[PDB]
Design a protein around this nucleic acid. Sequence first.
RNA 1: UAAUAGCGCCGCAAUUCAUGCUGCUUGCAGCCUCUGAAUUUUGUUAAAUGAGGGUUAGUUUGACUGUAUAAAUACAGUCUUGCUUUCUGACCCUGGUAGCUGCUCACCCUGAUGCUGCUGUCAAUAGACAGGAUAGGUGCGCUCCCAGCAAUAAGGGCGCGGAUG
Lengths: 85, 161, 605
Amino acid sequence: LSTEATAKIVSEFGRDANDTGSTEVQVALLTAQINHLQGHFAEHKKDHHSRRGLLRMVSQRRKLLDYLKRKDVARYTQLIERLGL
Amino acid sequence: VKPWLFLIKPYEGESLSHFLGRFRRANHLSASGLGTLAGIGAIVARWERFHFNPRPSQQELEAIASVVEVDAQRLAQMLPPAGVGMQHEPIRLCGACYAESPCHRIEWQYKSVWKCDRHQLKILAKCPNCQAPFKMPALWEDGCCHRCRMPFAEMAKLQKV
Amino acid sequence: ASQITIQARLISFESNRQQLWKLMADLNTPLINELLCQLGQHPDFEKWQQKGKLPSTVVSQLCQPLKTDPRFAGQPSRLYMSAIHIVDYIYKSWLAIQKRLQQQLDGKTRWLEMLNSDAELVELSGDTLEAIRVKAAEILAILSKTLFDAYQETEDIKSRSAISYLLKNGCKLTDKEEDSEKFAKRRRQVEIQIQRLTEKLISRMPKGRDLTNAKWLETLLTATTTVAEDNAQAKRWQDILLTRSSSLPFPLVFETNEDMVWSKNQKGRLCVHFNGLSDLIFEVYCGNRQLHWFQRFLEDQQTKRKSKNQHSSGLFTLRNGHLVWLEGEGKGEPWNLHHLTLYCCVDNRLWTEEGTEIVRQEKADEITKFITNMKKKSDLSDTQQALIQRKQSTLTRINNSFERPSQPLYQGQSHILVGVSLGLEKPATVAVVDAIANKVLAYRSIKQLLGDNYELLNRQRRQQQYLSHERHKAQKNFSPNQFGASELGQHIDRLLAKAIVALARTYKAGSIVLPKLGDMREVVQSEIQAIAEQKFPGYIEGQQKYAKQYRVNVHRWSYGRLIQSIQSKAAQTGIVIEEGKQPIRGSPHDKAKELALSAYNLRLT
RNA sequence: UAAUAGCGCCGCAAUUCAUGCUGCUUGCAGCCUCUGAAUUUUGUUAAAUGAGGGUUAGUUUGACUGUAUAAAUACAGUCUUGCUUUCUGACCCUGGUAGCUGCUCACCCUGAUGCUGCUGUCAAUAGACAGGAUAGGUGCGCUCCCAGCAAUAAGGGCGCGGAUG
Ligand SMILES: [Zn+2]
Ligand SMILES: [Zn+2]
């Protein structure tokens, strides 16, 4: 993921000026990477070395979503609606 | 005279890990040593870090019961009851419950527990002053954070209500 | 039974291959997939698993309504037959490797109940071990199947304990009242074998082949777009996403020899077209070593034609033929990348006229027995009478001999046997031994049989380690350069088989003896586990790293492949292969000598 | 500079045997000249192994008939097609240009079945140029050892931010 894209997605999932690493931001970064990767997996059906990375990103996002759900269901719902998961 | 050991009475809700650690520190034993004495090998060294990949069996607990002289049912009462899911990491602690009684509660390791029911405090997963994750319960020689030397009972007034 | 497969590439136009690829990859493999799935959820399925015999006609019954299906229509009948045959063979195998596994588990449970120590036998019987020993000797006076029958037959504690004492030593009376820890390890080993058989019995159902990979592509979208709710579902998504996207349609088994009609091209090249697809003409590209088989095929079909079908296709040198697609390296459409290949299964025994007579006698015996078996029933169905008619038709047509080469078979001296010893380190060692006078006529070693080729053996081991490392260094990089020395091992075992059969020919042997190895890679795994469970009491990783190299050497020790190669060559030559028991302790030469001697001793009755 | 030591493999020896050789004494006697088998026993000024990646519908191992031949086998004749593999050679290379994408790194410490290790020239940078399979170590290799790197083994330490159920 490009640095410009990460900065933009941090700002657009920001809760304040300095919130890099908030569960919302982490889920946003993972979702952006997975969305970019799904087309690559549509095309390159042999790139297993990216397949492992995709699996890892999916599991990471799942864990983050479960944690945010247990903590605050309201933030969880509004986040999952913002990303449409 | 009859063969004996420095017996330790189990607490209420203590972990198997913490109880075995107290038993070892009061007998100057080692995880390998305790396992060899019990007859189950290094499995004990696994239990001190909660890796229950093959749940502690009835035989592996009766063999311990023979050595630590605690009833096997009382031993199972420090493992999570059948079906209850626990997280082997991070090790979690409530300061107030430690001040009341210096032990590690197996109930703190449950996946479903985030609040101390008798203290209304959000239990701690890391040291509240230096963010140092807690060691395995068997490794608690005393109640203090290793990195910052802050007593466990003190942390009660840093942990949120 | 000396069936061997020859192969030849099939060359034709791009459209002639597009037709076949579309007609198999898009309609025949999906039919096989659906037939497998339906065979799985059949209500009688758990009944079949109890036996080893899937019913004769069930697969055709689930296929008759499937032929007219919108997505499985537009195929030749003899290709619906191919799909039926493939699925029937898959489930004829899958119900025979799970029934025998269940038998093994039952027998091992019975033996685990059998196993008692000297003290355990004393406490169960309530008598001194000496009385147990005396009664065990008495019962040995009155093989192991009989003792197991006696044990399962009686209920007395004393007699059953006597059976247990006998079978503990293996029908022997050993008076060494020692090694109780040995008994503990033996019971532990039997329990480990029980556990491993139980772990085996939970087997996957026959998968089938998914060329489109619709499930994979759908699951990728589900996993990326949505979020799982529990670990048990994300694990299933991960397992699906890592599956292997197979890209080769199933073969086409043509169980009738005549379904492949042969012809000669105007350029003299041999050509094939299959029943149901005659507009598709394939040109045979073989090698001259395999030319005589295909020329025999054309000559035999023409010979049957010229006699107005007075000749029984059924003595054809061709028995059946698979029509597979190999895998090509590169890109492009699948018909332009993968090479169509014909695998014809030929009964090598039919090449000579003399061997054709043997095949004729075999078929004329089995089919007249079939006629007698059907003649006892009084049902008298109409297609049953058609079958009866065909049987006598084959009887009549079998006595019309084609013109074939002549070779006076092989007169074998019954005395001279050949004993082959296999081992982890000495893959084979042969002893040509005369049985009348126990003196061995000859000995050979793994350097004598591989003469001028012995360098291969070391190069097999030197590089199968190397490749084993190279794979390991590429797996972590996820490169597809995983290579192994399977072809080298196959070549070496073929060389050994040729050398052994040639040696048997030179000394005019009358048989070849191979040991019955049984489950060899499992007994050693059980023993190593049992030993490591005391050597490492609670450390499972230690129990695994213990004797790791020995176990991987056993697992890659290809005794079965070598035995099969020697069996193929001996059948091709006429040597009557027998079986014996490899002595547990001894040098390879003595092992082979006593092995062949024991085989001769048992053969006499 | 270092590769010590271990392990596996070859060979070279030495010994004892025969499945060998000799002899008839035809199952015995000797011998190790060949062939092998089993040890141990060294790495010779050397014997044999030898693992950087690739390239041929490559050649040979083939079928039938007849002869000699009990047969193998040889010879002669007729036919020939390219499949799938194992070697031995010979030759080529040590890649480029584009994209798409994975992993790993605040900073330390230990150090993995971790990575790297050629010749020369120019530098002596960190890289080019030419060459190049002899390519760190031992006769040859290793996951072993040496050297450097080590975030991309694992473990431990540990700074500031955000999160902190
Ligand atoms: Zn509390
Ligand atoms: Zn602290």
